[PDB]
């Protein structure tokens, strides 16, 4: 429960829910000085400054990137590409990273918890959750991430449902 | 004599029909080759994980 | 008739040896639990 | 002792015996999301989910293999290319690995001993037993295994018996 306190205290400032008729459908994430928002999530950004923007579309990677004003570039997530195997710290507890795939134990994951970042033991974002499929006792995840070259990579398992 | 079809086509006009119709095929095949190389390079960049 | 017979036997035996060689190349990569076919052999022998 | 009990705990979940008319002829392994079954073993897999799946055959490596359904993919074994010399585990006690040869002290290994996954000091499958020969006072085995490249390698000593 100690890692989930860290995730909630880092999401209290830098994560914004995308509300449609009050209902949560997704989360905009401000990482590295650029706003991120998925395509299929419908609604508006909770923050008033971020809602009045012109988000350039990128339909392949299921993202709608934007740019952050200069007074807000220090209040962003830090991120990295470095990802050894083991455990990472999601919003609902922990998430296993094995063979280049983020897996969460089952039950959790429904319509609405998309766009949530995955943190490491230092406090840096390594992935952004878009969707996932339930492989029985454990749910694989479809995320975007980065690599050592500096290239945005999206991983997508089979038959993933958009969250 | 007998008027053959394409009898008076005047090599200048053969050149204008070869360039403005065969050259557009050259444009579309180099566009298709460029698109194929771009798709393979994007897949090579996402081989990194 | 003998030209047609030699042509049929040659095409059938060459296709049989080609299928044997394609199976003998693609078999040690389909038996692994991940089935990660390398890209050049997937271009050559028409894999997934 | 102690080593065999965690192996029984693993085999109770994922190693499935085959059903000949009154007895057990062999054991289907589910590793990495790909069901494995030996050829000379004939019968029916105990699960009605794993029975209906049509298997592809590889006669050089003596194994039928089919695709695992998506729910079962998380509840599979794991496989390892790297094996150092020493001692590995097995359902009938321990197995020695020396000069690339899985050998077993004699008195054990008979008919109905096929498809049992040789585990390691962590719980990952390094080999699959298909039979063996009595090399004097200690029997060697005829297993399939994997290497660094991703190539299924079968080793077989002289005049082995299809168990």
Curated annotation (Swiss-Prot), chains A, D:
Q: Which residues form the Peptidase S3 domain?
A: 14-163
Subcellular location per the Swiss-Prot or TrEMBL entry: Virion; Host cytoplasm; Host cell membrane; Host nucleus
Judging by the UniProt lineage, the source's domain of life is: Viruses
Modification Phosphothreonine occurs at: 15
Which residues carry out catalysis? 40 (charge relay system), 62 (charge relay system), 114 (charge relay system)
Where does the record place the site Involved in dimerization of the capsid protein?
88, 121
Summarize the PTM comment. Answer: Phosphorylated on serine and threonine residues.
* Region annotation (Ribosome-binding) ranges: 1-14
What's its job?
A: Forms an icosahedral capsid with a T=4 symmetry composed of 240 copies of the capsid protein surrounded by a lipid membrane through which penetrate 80 spikes composed of trimers of E1-E2 heterodimers. The capsid protein binds to the viral RNA genome at a site adjacent to a ribosome binding site for viral genome translation following genome release. Possesses a protease activity that results in its autocatalytic cleavage from the nascent structural protein.
Q: What is known of its domains?
A: The very N-terminus plays a role in the particle assembly process. The N-terminus also contains a nuclear localization signal and a supraphysiological nuclear export signal (supraNES), which is an unusually strong NES that mediates host CRM1 binding in the absence of RanGTP and thus can bind CRM1, not only in the nucleus, but also in the cytoplasm. The C-terminus functions as a protease during translation to cleave itself from the translating structural polyprotein.
**Whom does it interact with, and what assembly results?**
Homodimer. Homomultimer. Interacts with host karyopherin KPNA4; this interaction allows the nuclear import of the viral capsid protein. Interacts with spike glycoprotein E2. Interacts with host IRAK1; the interaction leads to inhibition of IRAK1-dependent signaling. Part of a tetrameric complex composed of host CRM1, host importin alpha/beta dimer and the viral capsid; this complex blocks the receptor-mediated transport through the nuclear pore. Interacts with host phosphatase PPP1CA; this interaction dephosphorylates the capsid protein, which increases its ability to bind to the viral genome.
Query: What is the protein name for this chain?
Result: Capsid protein
Gene source species: Venezuelan equine encephalitis virus (strain TC-83)
Upper classification of the source organism reads: Viruses, Riboviria, Orthornavirae, Kitrinoviricota, Alsuviricetes
Q: Which residues of the full protein are shown?
A: 113 to 275 of 1254
């Amino acid at each position: 429960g100690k890692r989930q306190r860290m995730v909630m205290k880092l999401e209290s400032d830098k994560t914004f829910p995308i509300m449609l008729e009050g209902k949560i459908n997704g989360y905009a994430c401000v990482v590295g000085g650029k706003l991120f928002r998925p395509m299929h999530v419908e609604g508006k950004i909770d923050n008033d400054v971020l809602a009045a923007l012109k988000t350039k579309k990128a339909s392949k990677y299921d993202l709608e990137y934007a740019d952050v004003p200069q007074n807000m570039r220090a209040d962003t997530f830090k991120y990295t590409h470095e990802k050894p195997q083991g455990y990472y710290s999601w919003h609902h507890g922990a998430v296993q990273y094995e063979n280049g795939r983020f897996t969460v134990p089952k039950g959790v994951g429904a319509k609405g918890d998309s766009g949530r970042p995955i943190l490491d033991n230092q406090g840096r974002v390594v992935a952004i959750v878009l969707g996932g499929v339930n492989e029985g006792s454990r749910t694989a995840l479809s995320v975007v991430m980065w690599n050592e070259k500096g290239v945005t990579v999206k991983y997508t398992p089979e038959n993933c449902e958009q969250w | 004599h007998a008027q053959t079809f394409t009898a008076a086509v005047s090599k200048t006009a053969w050149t204008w029909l070869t360039s403005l119709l065969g050259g557009s095929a050259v444009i579309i095949i180099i566009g298709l080759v460029l698109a194929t190389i771009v798709a393979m390079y994007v897949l090579t960049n996402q081989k990194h994980n | 008739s003998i030209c047609a017979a030699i042509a049929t036997v040659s095409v059938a035996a060459s296709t049989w040896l080609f299928c044997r060689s394609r199976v003998a190349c693609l078999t040690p990569y389909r038996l692994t639990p991940n089935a990660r076919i390398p890209f050049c052999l997937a271009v050559l022998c028409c894999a997934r």
